[PDB]
Design a protein around this ligand. Structure first.
Ligand SMILES: [N]
Lengths: 112, 17
């Protein structure tokens, strides 16, 4: 049982996971596997990892009290990407493209 | 997805797809 406003957030999450954004959303479909990739400083630099699979599990588990809590996790996910990766990296460009989608949708949903 | 070999090699994310 999600509130009307969190239902709009769930719709945004579904859009971010949809096929049309797959070319730039895929880095965010699961946590960064720093051990498998041997990025040995990832967790020293990124104190609070976040990704869309975790956001979805929290949404489905009714863990977000309001839209701002959902948006905080989405923005944390993007901020981690900007913090960890080189500024000209392909994955930073993908983050910006997906964040543009998110910020437009989040801005435009009904109020309250 | 990431190229595991090259990501480990260079210490930064390397895109395979
Ligand atoms: N790719």
């Amino acid at each position: 049982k999600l509130s009307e406003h969190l239902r709009y957030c769930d719709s945004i999450l579904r859009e971010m996971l949809s096929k049309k954004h797959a070319a730039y959303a895929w880095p965010f479909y699961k946590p960064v596997d720093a051990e498998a990739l041997e990025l040995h400083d990832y967790h020293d630099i990124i104190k609070h990892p976040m990704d869309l699979s975790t956001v979805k599990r929290k949404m489905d588990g009714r863990e977000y009290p309001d839209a701002q809590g959902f948006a905080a996790d989405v923005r944390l996910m993007f901020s981690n990407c900007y913090k960890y990766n080189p500024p000209d990296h392909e994955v930073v460009a993908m983050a910006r493209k997906l964040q543009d989608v998110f910020e437009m949708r989040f801005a435009k949903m009904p109020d309250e | 997805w990431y190229d595991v070999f090259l990501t480990r090699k260079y210490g930064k994310k390397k895109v395979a797809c």
